[PDB]
């Protein structure tokens, strides 16, 4: 016939779809009439003898019963529920649509008093895949009995580390000079030109990377003892105190660079940036590659009891630490919040709402926060540009696809 040939196609091809993973499938004899070949779980090719009975059916082509782009239903017979009873192994049923080579399955846990039969397949979340197999594979373990569990089943994932590859300038300038830093700030504060700080006065020496003569730093460097040196020769030291001096140079270097909007930060967390009139941003345009999305970078939330006054204003912040990585300097980013009264004083109470936000939070918002917070950071003397955080490949995959979301 025709549909018999379609069915004998479908059983072999769903055998292959089971065979694309470690999910060894076996056939059945001729006279059964109600259950087909049986699937056995193996992790990484190693068996542990967990069984699932599978029943095959297949069509050729066309729109199914009430078929949509996300869901489609089906009808089931009446005399098969006795064998579809939730026996020692669950009876997963599968259907084939040949046109897009789709193998549909829906969960069969246990029939009960309703006896609704039928089937309620959806297109996206109930298809044969290598991504949602743990939810597929967590069926034979019953609710009763403890100690039974199934490990993660194959697959992989690429995670990332919150790090910034910075692009440092090639050269910087060393200058031996007078005007000790308290006198230096006392003479540089009353200025209207480029009184910009990117130096450390240590042992009466300047160690700047921008031109000291061609700015408002002319009086500190004077008119002589100005030279240039490449950064690579003096980057490596045997003295850890000198490495701490270079870290001081790096921090004061960025203190120029990250003084973009409202920097010049007093705590160990930098980036106090904000707005001027409404104290909101609604910014950091993350264009991505399929759509752009915006998030409340600077947030204003009114108190519950009184609504006409702004309770607290929210900003974002991070703490750099300047760890070199085998003669290579990266910036370590540690995100944190910044509740503020109006922009200049710490808030009276804002801790239990941050803890409440963290209580309903996940780690999904953290990673998304880091990527949107670097999408702005990639964009005169300051380069103000940064690279891309590295990504790593995990041997195992988290079984969250087989679990329910937290709250």
């Amino acid at each position: 016939t025709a549909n018999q040939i379609i069915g004998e196609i479908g059983e072999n091809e769903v055998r292959g779809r089971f065979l694309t993973l470690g999910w060894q499938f076996d056939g059945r004899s001729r006279l059964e009439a109600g259950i087909d070949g049986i699937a056995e779980v193996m992790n990484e090719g190693q068996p542990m003898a967990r069984m699932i009975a599978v029943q095959i059916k297949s069509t050729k082509e066309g729109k199914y019963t009430s078929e949509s782009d996300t869901s489609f239903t089906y009808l089931l017979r009446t005399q098969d529920l006795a064998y579809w009873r939730g026996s020692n192994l669950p009876v997963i049923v599968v259907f084939y649509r040949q046109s897009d080579h789709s193998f549909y399955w829906k969960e069969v846990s246990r029939d009960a008093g309703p006896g609704e039969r039928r089937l309620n397949i959806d297109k996206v979340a109930d298809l044969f895949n290598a991504s949602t197999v743990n939810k597929l594979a967590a069926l034979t373990v019953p609710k009763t009995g403890l100690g039974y569990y199934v490990p993660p089943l194959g697959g992989g994932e690429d995670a990332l580390i919150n790090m910034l590859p910075l692009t440092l300038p090639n050269e910087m300038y060393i200058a031996s000079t007078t005007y000790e830093p308290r006198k230096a700030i006392a003479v540089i504060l009353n200025g209207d030109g480029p009184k910009r700080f990117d130096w450390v006065i240590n042992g009466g020496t300047f160690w700047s990377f921008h031109d000291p003569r061609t700015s408002a730093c002319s009086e500190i460097v004077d008119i002589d003892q100005v030279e240039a040196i490449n950064t690579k020769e003096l980057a490596l030291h045997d003295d850890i105190d000198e490495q701490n001096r270079f870290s001081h140079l790096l921090r004061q270097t960025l203190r120029y660079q990250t003084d973009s909007d409202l920097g010049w930060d007093k705590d160990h967390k930098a980036l106090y940036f904000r707005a001027i009139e409404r104290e909101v941003s609604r910014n950091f345009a993350y264009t991505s590659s399929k759509k752009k999305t915006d998030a409340n970078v600077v947030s204003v939330f009114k108190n519950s009891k009184d609504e006409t006054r702004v309770s607290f204003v929210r900003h974002h912040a991070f703490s750099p630490r300047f760890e070199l990585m085998a003669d290579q300097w990266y910036l370590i980013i540690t995100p944190t919040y910044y509740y503020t009264t109006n922009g200049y004083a710490p808030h009276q109470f804002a801790a239990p709402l941050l803890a409440g936000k963290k209580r309903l939070d996940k780690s999904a918002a953290l990673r998304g926060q880091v990527i949107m917070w670097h999408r702005f950071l990639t964009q005169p003397e300051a380069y103000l540009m940064f690279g891309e955080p590295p990504s790593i490949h995990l041997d195992v995959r988290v079984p969250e696809d087989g679990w329910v979301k937290e709250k």
Partner: protein
């Protein structure tokens, strides 16, 4: 730069009849403890009020027959407690004897309640409790472990509403009795009562439901009373002989003095796992967390002598864990004190709990337990995380992972040592929880230091670990 990563399987622990399981509760339920008890009864004593003695008896008779856990969402996270009857996990009975019925007097609690000097209230309360316990130990009614469950009335006039502690000097004084003690706040034994907290006096403490407290307290009582260990980490086939030492730090009950701490464990011949402390106090030299030379040398001499006394042979490998920086001030002393005794292998790992960088993955869940990344020598290891067994994440935020910094004198690679301490984290005899984060020698040394913080000079310390958890 591309960073290599590693995933370690969840370790399995030893139990009775050569069993191996990764869950202490299930490992006790299927197999029983690693060492059984020749006797069949464990005697319990109660100190406190008459109502507290009553509800302690009610707690024992309530959990004797078995009490179920919590909701059905995570059956592997809250297993039922099968009681102390025919199918006991410990295979022993737990009885309260009639001679240990220490009831306090309301006149004394009115007396101490007076708070002219808060310090003398704590001292005289603890001295009277320890005197009564000593009077109980003298007679022919010696218990095995004493529940000294405090009442709300005494504690609220000594801890919150008045600043010394209670547990510290209390266990510092309960040191000559031939049985340990266990403090039980009144909420554990009676769940109807609600005890308010100190600072947020409107708010109050929240606890577990019934059976998790039952599991933890029953395991603690069994280990304290019998002295036979419930479980130990399974040794690997064809592995060398090893010895684990840990070093922690503390500050005394004064302004500017730091006194350090240590702990030690190894294995026995047949089936066992010792875990002790030291009988000698540690003095102070400065305020940085440092070790000098003679302190580290005598620590190594003590641990090697205690191994040699038990196994009749020196160990082949020494594993040391610290908390502050492994510098050359004490590493020379450690290495010299090892090479005078001929031990070949040597590992020295600084543990950092103070980092500033994490690892970010797709989805709403963080990385699993035991995820390893190698930062060119640094060994960043997530000793907590999601669970394929508990089925969820037991927490709120991203966990702070351990940072392994092996000393350059160490022998093994950074990936083997992290797997070793990953096996070592779950040897906490305080509770049956799986999500341990710090390793057990650092935890034990922290407990020893917290007890020794308030010990008066000239008092003999006990190496028995039952007086510490």
């Amino acid at each position: 730069m591309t960073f290599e990563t590693r995933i370690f399987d969840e370790p399995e622990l030893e139990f009775g009849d050569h069993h191996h399981h990764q869950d202490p509760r299930l490992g006790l339920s299927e197999a029983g403890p690693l060492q059984t008890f020749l006797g069949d009864v464990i005697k319990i004593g109660v100190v406190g009020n008459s109502k507290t003695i009553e509800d302690t008896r009610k707690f024992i008779e309530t959990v004797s027959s078995g009490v179920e856990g919590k909701g059905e969402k995570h059956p592997n996270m809250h297993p039922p407690f099968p009681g102390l009857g025919n199918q006991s996990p410990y295979r022993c009975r737990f009885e309260i004897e009639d001679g240990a019925t220490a009831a306090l007097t309301k006149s004394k609690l009115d007396k101490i309640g007076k708070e002219p000097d808060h310090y003398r209230a704590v001292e005289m309360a603890v001295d009277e409790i320890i005197g009564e316990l000593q009077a109980m130990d003298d007679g022919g009614s010696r218990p095995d472990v004493a529940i000294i469950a405090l009442p709300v009335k005494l504690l609220e006039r000594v801890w919150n509403a008045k600043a010394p502690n209670f547990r510290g000097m209390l266990k510092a004084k309960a040191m000559g009795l031939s049985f340990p003690i266990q403090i039980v706040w009144e909420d554990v034994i009676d769940d109807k009562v609600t005890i308010p907290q100190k600072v947020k006096e409107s708010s109050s403490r929240k606890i577990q439901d019934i059976a998790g407290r039952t599991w933890n307290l029953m395991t603690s009582l069994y280990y304290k009373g019998s002295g036979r260990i419930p479980w130990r980490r399974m040794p690997l086939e064809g592995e060398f002989s090893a010895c684990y030492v840990g070093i922690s730090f503390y500050r005394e009950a004064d302004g500017q003095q730091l006194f350090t701490s240590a702990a030690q464990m190894f294995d026995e011949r047949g089936r066992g796992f010792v875990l002790k402390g030291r009988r000698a106090r540690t003095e102070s030299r400065g305020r940085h967390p440092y070790m000098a030379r003679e302190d580290a040398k005598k620590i190594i001499e003590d641990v090697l002598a205690a191994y040699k006394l038990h196994h009749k042979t020196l160990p082949a490998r020494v594993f040391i864990l610290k908390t502050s920086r492994f510098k050359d001030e004490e590493a020379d002393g450690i290495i010299a004190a090892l090479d005078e005794a001929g031990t070949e292998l040597r590992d020295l790992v600084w543990v950092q709990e103070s980092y500033t960088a994490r690892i970010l993955r797709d989805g709403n869940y963080p990385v699993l337990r035991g995820t390893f990344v190698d930062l060119h020598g640094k060994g960043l290891l997530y000793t907590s995380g999601s669970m394929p067994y508990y089925g969820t994440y037991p927490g709120k935020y991203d966990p702070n992972p351990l940072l392994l910094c092996p000393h350059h004198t160490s022998e093994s690679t950074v990936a083997q040592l992290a797997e070793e301490i990953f096996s070592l984290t779950k040897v906490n005899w305080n509770s049956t929880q799986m999500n341990q984060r710090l390793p057990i020698p650092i935890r034990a040394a922290r407990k020893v230091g917290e007890v020794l913080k308030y010990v008066g000079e000239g008092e003999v310390i006990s190496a028995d670990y039952r007086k510490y958890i």
